[PDB]
């Protein structure tokens, strides 16, 4: 009564506010439910192999167009699978790959001294990663011949380079310390460098 | 009808309006026919019959009321309940006299009116809290609890801002160039509306305005001169608080307020403690609030707390209160209508019961 | 038309028709359950936390928070009906809404409503002549009016309240200044005395007032009282023309003070002299009452005297006591005689809670009396007040003329049959409306069937086939539903009631059904 | 870089003119069915917040608030027409809108407003000339034809069913407020013909009282309520000691003045009432207060007192009872004691007492008894009554009549169509245009029904040519070609001549708009 008369006249009490927030949130919640079916035919590339449970009609215009774009995508992605073995170049050439390493290609510049299970396990993880991402340039070597008399208490130091610009750093075991460190966590860190797009729990 | 005979004005709109449409200064259509020209100029000639908070004439009020909403408001009050204002305090005689004229010349269905203090309290959005009705010519204390003004709790004090200006010009002769003429009274009031603030107190303000002279404000005015050392400005509020300045030595206004609150039960005073809003009429400058706060805090027990409320604009406050009460949606339970007017006359208005 | 004012509700023909029909449907369906001695009992809550128990239609209309054009028209029409007649107002809205529902089924069938309007007016006229010819007279006696009052008191309230109030009302109308001129109840007031049982309300010969000795040192019960009816100032007064006192010593102060209370004392000495002249000793009662106030000075001056004084009574109180006690009201003391005095037999006072009362009874020939309602609940008091108002309205509408018609569907079904047989005469598609118009009155008994608990068509056809060669005056029973003659129990109703009923219902239906377009203009953007 | 206030908005061209014409349409479409004896009712929401049901032009539009102020302009002309002659407002509005539509068909082809306005002037000239050439008189000497005109007027209104009834209720009320003073200036003041409405009662209960009916009551039980020949006097002084205008505060010094002052005030009241008692009165009414001493005095003499009365009611009662209002009881004369009332009547119509001053001689100011079932009903009946009195007054000041329902308007369209070809000039095209626009009048009447408008239109258009069969209109209830010489539909010439002039002139003035500015003081 009196409060709503106040409301017509004044705004001294606030009580009619904030009832639009949950309204808009629920609107968007109902809206975002059509994204599952919007791209049902626009994601899978095996739907042709999924005959008799995916076909209702074929317009042969946008769907053959989908095959065309899909095959272009496939050829573009499989023309780049050239790697998969971490390689040991020498320090003499080092200037030629710190700089002349290709523009638009990430370089995981790994430096290490073999012998500690830290460096050994890190080398194992990156070598196994090479089996998954053959589109990434891996480099392994002895830092002593890469950097003269490099402090041996600063290994293994991960370097992320492209066009001579350091984008990501992971210096020493201070960020990799522990035998509990695993495959997916390394992949997670290199994804966080901005090179890879994947998903992990933690 | 949201017409309200204020302190000197009558403002006519509707309950749902945000403001009255017409004013009451006590050639829109005056070049087409001139029918209303004569009526409105004649009503304009008639004066304001209300002074000091009591009605003083009766023929002129109805004379003005007839025209004021029969020639511009364009309303038939026979088909409308009526809501006017009234002088701050009157005995039942004026109320039951006005009922007679209203009915006998308009026969409007129902009525209700209330004291201006209640309208101000509603406008500020309160149903509780005593307001300092520092009206022109005379001030009054109206402690309002739930809306109805207590007939046993109204106090009236003769202080006025006119009196403050007069006392200033009674100690402005001591300032050298005195001020008494109409122009000089006007310039004293102008300076008062420019600077008569309160910091804490008389002697300490005068020391900081004379020993260090850092409270001086030079008056570069066509009608003014640099004749104030910071004394005369603060010399207006002081007599507002300390009676012996004016030569009429009595108790302070704070004493009157304190007694008018203490005579009631202590519990309800808590609610009166709650808001304790103020009103203008003689006060327009800050420093009033905290000063009276601490001054009555001397009179207020430290175990209980006190609040001070003062809105900056209170010009249509009575009109706002009237508009709110016109839409309260329960005030019709207290309408006094023909069903009782033609049954009992003015006797029920007198509260024959109790 | 949302272009001339972008914010304006514009509704076309069918929109207006549909909204009117829906509102009427809601209203009529809500009000079905509020008629008959077996209607459903409604509880209402005001905008304060206050509760009223009503069976009245207008109360329901004006207590609902409803903001609608047709609902507003309904409220106004029912207000007028309650003002004029004030009984069975439910019938108004039921008839209007039922006719709306009927005409819907044919306008929806492409029938433009004008033709239905002329059909309805022809049905009005024919039913008018039928009711005029079947209206039957009877000399107004005590038992006739007992039955007439029982009708309305079973209509609006329950059994025992009806049982007491029929007696109360029939005795109330007996008390009258002039049997051969119209009665008016402003001389017969209603006062609410909320401390006793619902069965303790009764009628009191004379008047009882709510205000007593404003200067209490007086007696407690007086007998054989003469009455003084004055309208003069018995309190101190200041002359309108302003003036002041002037002196130079305290002796002048004493003189002026003692001379300032001289005129009022002269008045009271006039009164005391008149009292002693009218009656000296022997303790004969002598009551003085002034409309205006009495100052404490003269109050004590007369309280030390055995005289009892009353002040500040209702304005019509004195005007009715003028006739009641047989005296003449005094407006000044310029001349005076004992003739202007009234008289009463016994006057006593009784206290309750915070207020006391002054009883004036044993009138020599009671021509003004008072009805007292005693009950626990204030809403119960108000409901009984509505009941007594309905009873007095019904008895007035009975006595004013000398004709009355059977109720409870009897004459309703009678003109139903008559109009059905007459319809072959009338022409055009308006004929169909006549049928609908017939169906109009059919709502009246069948809701009673809904208010009784029987199959509606079964009872309807029983009563319709009850028609012998001549038109039986047969209504609907309230316990068996079988057709029964109206005269045997003797429940009837006033003629002009149904007359104005038909008038208002037909005209309002015309107004509703002729509309073309709905606007909500008047919005200043 | 700016020059003026940023709130300036100036627009011009044919586009805004066309928008104005569409505004004229959007007004004209709101009212297109409430015309003629066959009408379809319309309801409106009052801008103040109430409800209203009307079917005449201005009364609908006067309760309508708009933007695009041209709509306000047509509202203004609607109010002007309504207060001017008081009928056919819907007709004027619909004519204006549709003929503006027709003119737009002529503006759009590069044509100038000036030639259109010249054609407008020539068109209205020919309209009025031929209307006078066709306007026929009628003798105002009977109940027959007057009631026929009332029937023909309110057949388009809701009270058509009680037409004859209403007829009489109108006719009487006109003859008994009609007054003439100083050997000239016969007057029919509707204000003196005060309208009053009473809850309850039947529609047929409506009637005008041969006297004055007022909403008051006696002011004391003693004052009797039955007087056959009332000796009434019209008081204009308050009953209390006079205050005047002088200053106050005489100085009291002794103990023998106070009660002496009270007594002298009482004796002043004594003399003031005595000068009234002298002339042997029965009843007295006043516009101001009454003192208890005075009422006691008049009670001693058995005189009847009445408290404040409205000034308009005061003047009406002065006209009725033949008394002259006086404010000087101490200067009273025998000249003006009221006499001419048939009976003092103090009844209770409803539950509020009224005073009924039945009169026995020719009165000049009535109160109309009205009975119904709702304030809405009585308001609608009221509006019908003003229509009735205005049209009756117009006939009182016009002995000429022209048939309605669409006959003479088709006839004048034909006549001016014939007149157009005589001259040579392109201006005939806009000129003749308005006659084509005029052809809107019967359409709605047929369109109110749904008949084959084309054949009826062509038939009437032809028939108005041979043997000047210029008297044929449409029977609205039947929607069939008929002759007005038998149906009995006639309207005062004032209303339709006003319609002509007003519509043509507002058409003239709504064309001159090309440039608009907003955002200024």
Curated annotation (Swiss-Prot), chain A:
Keyword match Lipoprotein: no
The PTM entry states: N-terminal methionine acetylation destabilizes the protein.
Reading the lineage from the top rank, the first entry is: Eukaryota
Q: Which UniProt keywords apply?
A: Acetylation, Angiogenesis, Apoptosis, Chaperone, Cytoplasm, Endoplasmic reticulum, Phosphoprotein
The ranges of region (Thioredoxin fold) come to: 83-202
Where in the cell is the protein located? Cytoplasm; Cytoplasm, Perinuclear region; Endoplasmic reticulum
- Where does tissue-level expression of this protein occur? Expressed in endothelial cells (at protein level). Expressed in all tissues examined including spleen, thymus, prostate, testis, ovary, small intestine and colon.
What GO biological process, any one, is recorded here?
A: actin cytoskeleton organization
Q: Phosphoserine (modified residue): where? A: 35
Query: In the UniProt record, which is one GO cellular component term?
Result: nucleoplasm
Keyword Cell membrane part of the UniProt annotation: no
User: What GO molecular functions are on record for this protein?
Assistant: protein folding chaperone; vascular endothelial growth factor receptor 2 binding
Region Interaction with XIAP, as annotated, extends over 89-91, 145-147
Give every Phosducin domain span: 24-172
Subunit structure, per the record? Interacts (via thioredoxin fold region) with KDR/VEGFR2 (via juxtamembrane domain). Forms ternary complexes with the chaperonin CCT complex and actin substrate, leading to inhibition of actin folding. Interacts with XIAP (via BIR 3 and RING domain). Interacts with HSP90AA1 and HSP90AB1.
Role of this protein? Acts as a chaperone for the angiogenic VEGF receptor KDR/VEGFR2, increasing its abundance by inhibiting its ubiquitination and degradation. Inhibits the folding activity of the chaperonin-containing T-complex (CCT) which leads to inhibition of cytoskeletal actin folding. Acts as a chaperone during heat shock alongside HSP90 and HSP40/70 chaperone complexes. Modulates the activation of caspases during apoptosis.
What protein is this chain from? Answer: Phosducin-like protein 3
Q: What is the lineage of its organism?
A: Eukaryota, Metazoa, Chordata, Craniata, Vertebrata
From Swiss-Prot, chain C:
**Classification via CDD domains:** TCP1_zeta (cd03342)
What EC number(s) does its UniProt record assign? 3.6.1.-
Which molecular function terms from Gene Ontology are attached?
Answer: ATP binding; ATP hydrolysis activity; ATP-dependent protein folding chaperone; protein folding chaperone; RNA binding; unfolded protein binding; WD40-repeat domain binding
- Keyword match Endoplasmic reticulum: no
Keywords for this protein: Acetylation, ATP-binding, Chaperone, Cytoplasm, Hydrolase, Isopeptide bond, Nucleotide-binding, Phosphoprotein, Ubl conjugation
What Gene3D superfamilies would the database entry show? GroEL (3.50.7.10), GroEL-like equatorial domain (1.10.560.10), TCP-1-like chaperonin intermediate domain (3.30.260.10)
Q: Name one GO biological process term.
A: positive regulation of protein localization to Cajal body
What is this enzyme's catalytic activity, as reactions?
ATP + H2O = ADP + phosphate + H(+)
Q: Which InterPro entries match?
A: Chap_CCT_zeta (IPR012722), Chaperone_TCP-1 (IPR017998), Chaperonin_TCP-1_CS (IPR002194), Cpn60/GroEL/TCP-1 (IPR002423), GroEL-like_apical_dom_sf (IPR027409), GROEL-like_equatorial_sf (IPR027413), TCP-1-like_intermed_sf (IPR027410), TCP-1_chaperonin (IPR053374)
**Compartments (UniProt record):** Cytoplasm
Q: Where is this cross-link: Glycyl lysine isopeptide (Lys-Gly) (interchain with G-Cter in SUMO2)?
A: 248
The protein's superkingdom reads Eukaryota
Chain residues that bind Mg(2+):
87
PTM sites of type Phosphoserine: 202
PTM-bearing positions, type N6-acetyllysine: 2, 196, 284, 362, 374, 385
What would be one Gene Ontology cellular-component term for the protein?
Answer: microtubule
Q: What does this protein do?
A: Component of the chaperonin-containing T-complex (TRiC), a molecular chaperone complex that assists the folding of actin, tubulin and other proteins upon ATP hydrolysis. The TRiC complex mediates the folding of WRAP53/TCAB1, thereby regulating telomere maintenance.
Family matches, as PANTHER family: CHAPERONIN (PTHR11353)
- Give the record's subunit note: Component of the chaperonin-containing T-complex (TRiC), a hexadecamer composed of two identical back-to-back stacked rings enclosing a protein folding chamber. Each ring is made up of eight different subunits: TCP1/CCT1, CCT2, CCT3, CCT4, CCT5, CCT6A/CCT6, CCT7, CCT8. Interacts with PACRG.
- How is this protein named in the record? T-complex protein 1 subunit zeta
Swiss-Prot record, chain D:
Transmembrane among keywords: no
Q: Indicate which residues the UniProt annotation says bind ATP.
A: 36, 88-90, 405, 476, 491
Q: Is the Chaperone keyword given for this protein? A: yes
Could you say which residues bind Mg(2+) here?
Answer: 87
Residues bearing PTM Phosphotyrosine? 241
Cross-linked residues, Glycyl lysine isopeptide (Lys-Gly) (interchain with G-Cter in SUMO2): 9, 242-243, 375
Name of the protein in question: T-complex protein 1 subunit gamma
Name the source organism.
Homo sapiens
UniProt gene name: CCT3
């Amino acid at each position: 009564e009196w409060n709503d008369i106040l409301r017509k006249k004044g705004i001294l009490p606030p009580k009619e506010s904030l009832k639009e927030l949950e309204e808009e949130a629920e609107e968007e919640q109902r809206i975002l439910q059509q994204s599952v079916v919007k791209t049902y035919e626009d994601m899978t590339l095996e739907e042709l192999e999924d005959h008799e449970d995916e076909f209702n009609e074929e317009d042969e215009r946008a769907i053959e167009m989908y095959r065309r774009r899909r095959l272009a995508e496939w050829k573009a992605t499989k023309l780049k699978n050239k790697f998969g073995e971490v390689l040991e170049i020498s320090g003499k050439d080092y200037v030629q790959e710190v700089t002349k390493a290709g523009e638009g290609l990430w370089v995981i510049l790994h430096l290490y001294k073999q012998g500690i299970p830290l460096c050994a396990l890190i080398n194992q993880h990156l070598s196994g990663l090479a089996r998954k991402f053959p589109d990434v340039k891996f480099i392994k070597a002895i830092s002593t011949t890469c950097i003269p008399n490099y402090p041996d208490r600063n290994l293994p130091t991960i370097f992320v380079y492209l066009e001579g610009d350091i984008k990501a750093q992971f210096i020493g075991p201070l960020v990799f310390g522990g035998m509990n460190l695993t495959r997916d966590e390394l992949e997670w860190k290199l994804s966080e460098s901005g090179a890879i797009m994947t998903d992990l729990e933690e | 009808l949201v017409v309200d005979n204020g302190s000197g004005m009558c403002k006519a709109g509707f309950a749902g309006d945000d403001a009255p449409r017409a004013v009451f200064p006590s050639g829109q259509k005056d070049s087409y026919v001139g029918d209303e020209a004569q009526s409105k100029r004649g009503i304009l000639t008639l004066k304001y019959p209300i002074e000091h908070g009591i009605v003083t004439n009766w023929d002129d009020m109805e004379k003005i009321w007839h025209h004021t909403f029969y020639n511009e408001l364009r309303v038939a009050p026979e088909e409308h309940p009526v809501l006017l204002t009234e002088a701050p305090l009157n005995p039942k005689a004026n109320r039951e006299k006005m009922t007679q004229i209203m009915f006998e010349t308009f026969n409007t269905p129902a009525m209700y009116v209330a004291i201006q203090a209640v309208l101000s309290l509603y406008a500020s959005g309160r149903t509780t809290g005593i307001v300092m009705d520092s009206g022109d010519g005379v001030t009054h204390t109206v402690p309002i609890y739930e809306g109805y003004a207590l007939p046993h709790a109204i106090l009236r004090l003769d202080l006025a801002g006119r009196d403050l200006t007069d006392y200033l010009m009674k100690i402005l002769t001591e300032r050298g160039y005195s001020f008494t003429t109409t122009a000089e009274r006007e310039i004293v009031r102008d300076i008062k509306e420019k600077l008569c603030y309160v910091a804490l107190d008389f002697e300490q303000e005068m020391a900081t305005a004379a020993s260090s002279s850092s409270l001086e404000k030079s008056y570069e005015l066509p009608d003014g001169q640099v004749i104030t050392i910071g004394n005369e400005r603060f010399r207006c509020p002081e007599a507002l608080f300390q009676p012996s300045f004016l030569g009429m030595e009595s108790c302070g206004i704070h004493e009157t307020t304190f007694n008018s609150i203490m005579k009631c039960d202590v519990d309800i005073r808590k609610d009166l403690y709650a808001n304790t809003v103020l009103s203008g009429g003689t006060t327009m400058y800050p420093g009033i609030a905290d000063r009276m706060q601490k001054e009555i805090t001397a009179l207020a027990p430290s175990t209980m707390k006190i609040k001070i409320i003062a809105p900056p604009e209170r010009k249509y406050s009575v009109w706002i209160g009237g508009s709110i009460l016109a839409s309260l949606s329960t005030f019709q339970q207290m309408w006094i209508s023909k069903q009782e007017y033609d049954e009992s006359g003015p006797s029920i208005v007198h509260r024959k019961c109790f | 038309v949302k272009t001339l004012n972008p914010k304006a509700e514009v509704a076309r023909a069918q929109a207006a028709l549909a909204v009117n029909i829906s509102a009427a449907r809601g209203l009529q369906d809500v009000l079905r359950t509020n008629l008959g001695p077996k209607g459903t009992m409604k509880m209402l809550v005001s905008g304060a936390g206050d509760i009223k128990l009503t069976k009245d239609g207008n109360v329901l209309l004006h207590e609902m928070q409803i903001q609608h054009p047709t609902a507003s028209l309904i409220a106004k029409v029912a207000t007028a009906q309650d003002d004029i007649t004030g009984d069975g107002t439910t019938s108004n809205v039921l008839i209007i809404g039922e006719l709306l529902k009927q005409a819907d089924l044919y306008i929806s069938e492409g029938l433009h409503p004008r033709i239905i309007t002329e059909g309805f007016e022809a049905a009005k006229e024919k039913a008018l002549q039928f009711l005029e010819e079947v209206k039957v007279s009877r000399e107004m006696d005590r038992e006739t009016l007992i039955d007439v009052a029982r009708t309305s008191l079973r209509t609006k309230v329950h059994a025992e309240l009806a049982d007491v109030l029929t007696e109360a009302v029939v005795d109330s109308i007996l008390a009258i200044k002039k049997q051969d001129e119209p009665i008016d109840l402003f001389m017969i007031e209603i006062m609410e005395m909320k401390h006793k049982s619902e069965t303790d309300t009764s009628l009191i010969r004379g008047l009882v007032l709510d205000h007593g000795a404003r200067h209490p040192d007086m007696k407690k019960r007086v007998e054989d009282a003469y009455i003084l009816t004055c309208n003069v100032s018995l309190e101190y007064e200041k002359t309108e023309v302003n003036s002041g006192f002037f002196y130079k010593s305290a002796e002048e102060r004493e003189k002026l003070v003692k001379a300032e209370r001289k005129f009022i004392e002269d008045r009271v000495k006039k009164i005391i002299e008149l009292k002693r002249k009218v009656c000296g000793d022997s303790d004969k009662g002598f009551v003085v009452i002034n409309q205006k106030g009495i100052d404490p000075f003269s109050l004590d001056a007369l309280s030390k005297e055995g005289i009892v004084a009353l002040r500040r009574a209702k304005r019509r109180n004195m005007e009715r006591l003028t006739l009641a006690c047989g005296g003449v009201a005094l407006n000044s003391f310029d001349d005076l005689s004992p003739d202007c005095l009234g008289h009463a037999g016994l006057v006593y006072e009784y206290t309750l809670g915070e207020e006391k009362f002054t009883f004036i009874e044993k009138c020599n020939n009671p021509r003004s009396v008072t009805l007292l309602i005693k009950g626990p609940n204030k809403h119960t008091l108000t409901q009984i007040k509505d009941a007594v108002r309905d009873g007095l309205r019904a008895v007035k509408n009975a006595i004013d003329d000398g004709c009355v018609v059977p109720g409870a569907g009897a004459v309703e079904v009678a003109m139903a049959e008559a109009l059905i047989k007459h319809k072959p005469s009338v022409k055009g598609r308006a004929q169909l409306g006549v049928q609908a118009f017939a169906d109009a009155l059919l709502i009246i008994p069948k809701v009673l069937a809904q208010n009784s608990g029987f199959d509606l068509q079964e009872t309807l056809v029983k009563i319709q086939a009850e028609h012998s060669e001549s038109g039986q005056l047969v209504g609907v029973d309230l316990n068996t539903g079988e057709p029964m003659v109206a005269a045997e129990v003797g429940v009837w109703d006033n003629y002009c009631v149904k007359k104005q009923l038909l008038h208002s219902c037909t005209v309002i239906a015309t107004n509703i059904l002729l509309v073309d377009e709905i606007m909500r203009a008047g919005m200043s953007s | 870089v700016l020059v003026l206030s940023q709130n300036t908005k100036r627009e011009s061209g044919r586009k805004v003119q066309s928008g104005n014409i569409n505004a004229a349409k959007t007004i004209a479409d709101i009212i297109r069915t409430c015309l003629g004896p066959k009408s379809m009712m319309k309801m409106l929401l009052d801008p103040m917040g109430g409800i209203v049901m009307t079917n005449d032009g201005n009364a609908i539009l006067r309760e309508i608030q708009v933007q695009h102020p041209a709509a306000k302009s047509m509202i203004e002309i609607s109010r002007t027409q309504d207060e001017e002659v008081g009928d056919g407002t819907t007709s004027v509005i619909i004519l204006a809108g549709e003929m503006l539509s027709v003119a737009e068909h002529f503006l759009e082809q590069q044509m100038h407003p000036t030639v259109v306005i010249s054609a407008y002037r020539k068109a209205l000239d020919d309209m009025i000339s031929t209307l006078k050439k066709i306007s026929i008189p009628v003798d105002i000497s009977d109940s027959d034809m007057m009631l026929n005109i009332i029937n023909s007027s309110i057949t388009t209104k809701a009270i058509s069913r009680w037409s004859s009834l209403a007829c009489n209720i109108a006719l009487d009320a006109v003859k008994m407020v009609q007054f003439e003073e100083n050997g000239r200036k016969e007057i029919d003041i509707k204000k003196y013909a005060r309208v009053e409405k009473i809850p309850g009662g039947i529609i047929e209960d409506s009637c005008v009282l041969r006297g004055v009916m007022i909403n008051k009551d006696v002011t004391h039980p003693r004052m009797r309520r039955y007087i056959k020949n009332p000796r009434i006097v019209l008081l204009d002084s308050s009953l209390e000691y006079k205050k005047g205008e002088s200053q106050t505060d005489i100085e009291i010094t002794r103990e023998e003045d106070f009660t002496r002052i009270l007594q002298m005030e009482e004796e002043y009241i004594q003399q003031l009432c005595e000068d009234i008692i002298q002339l042997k009165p029965d009843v007295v009414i006043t516009e101001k207060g009454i003192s208890d001493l005075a009422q006691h005095y008049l009670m001693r003499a058995n005189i009847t007192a009445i408290r404040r009365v409205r000034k308009t009611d005061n003047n009406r009662i002065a006209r009725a009872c033949g008394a002259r209002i006086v404010s000087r009881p101490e200067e009273l004369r025998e000249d003006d004691v009221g006499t001419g009332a048939g009976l003092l009547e103090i009844k209770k119509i409803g539950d509020e007492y009224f005073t009924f001053i039945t009169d026995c001689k020719d009165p000049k100011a009535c109160t109309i008894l009205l009975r119904g079932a709702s304030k809405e009903i009585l308001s609608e009946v009221e509006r019908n009554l003003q229509d009735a009195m205005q049209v009756c007054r117009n006939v009182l000041l016009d002995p000429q009549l022209v048939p309605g329902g669409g006959a003479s308007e088709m006839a004048v369209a034909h006549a001016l169509t014939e007149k157009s070809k005589a001259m040579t000039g392109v201006e005939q095209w806009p000129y003749r245009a308005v006659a084509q626009a005029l052809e809107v009048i019967p359409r709605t009447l047929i369109q109110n029904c749904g008949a084959s408008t084309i054949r009826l239109l062509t038939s009437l258009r032809a028939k108005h040519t041979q043997e000047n069969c210029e008297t044929w209109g449409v029977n609205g209830e039947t929607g069939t070609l008929v002759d007005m010489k038998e149906l009995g539909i006639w309207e005062p010439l004032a209303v339709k001549l006003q319609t002509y002039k007003t519509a043509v002139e507002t058409a003239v003035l709504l064309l001159r708009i090309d440039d608009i500015v907003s955002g200024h003081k």
